[PDB]
Amino acid sequence: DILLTQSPAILSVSPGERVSFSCRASQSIGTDIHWYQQRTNGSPRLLIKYASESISGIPSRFSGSGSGTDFTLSINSVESEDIANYYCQQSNRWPFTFGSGTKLEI
């Protein structure tokens, strides 16, 4: 099964700064990667789908990029509401798998 590596595990950044979490697939998955946000005690929330396509209702602040095995989820200008855990998930090959998660910390 495809392995999604998310490192660093924790990301520290100053308010307003730009930030990026990385997700590496154990094999080439095209752009079949998706990003989810999960705040303390909430359920996951789809941020970016298919590596770069944006979802409606998601701050224009969130962008995605990458293809193959290296994917990036960026937040231009971080802010308190962004403090959560971020996961990546691939649908290239069965079964869908999840990343270990990266905690954003301001």
Partner: protein, 103 residues
């Protein structure tokens, strides 16, 4: 309206139905098989089309028995449909060449 042209038409509506069903059945059959890639509707549809036209680039293909079974049906439908059109074009040319000569 002439038979060959009715068949051609039918063949097309049919092919489309098979492509759609083929897409659905493929995903249904392939999910659950580790490493399978024919697992989302959109690409599956692209898969069946490229299979029906017999092009098959290899970017997508079934790996399970039912998926392959679905593939065969799609291949055969695409081949028969397109061949049935060729056959209709022949009946058309043949029928009209008889005219350009009289009968």
């Amino acid at each position: 309206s002439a038979l060959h042209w009715r068949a051609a038409g039918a063949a097309t509506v049919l092919l489309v139905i098979v492509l759609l069903a083929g897409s659905y059945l493929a995903v249904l059959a392939e999910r659950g098989a580790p490493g399978a890639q024919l697992i989302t509707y959109p690409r599956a549809l692209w898969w069946s089309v490229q299979t029906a036209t017999t092009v098959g680039y290899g970017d997508l293909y079934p790996v399970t028995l039912w998926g392959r079974c679905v593939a065969v049906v799609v291949m055969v439908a695409g081949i028969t449909s397109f061949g049935l059109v060729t056959a209709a074009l022949a009946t058309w040319f043949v029928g009209r060449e008889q005219e350009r000569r009289g009968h």
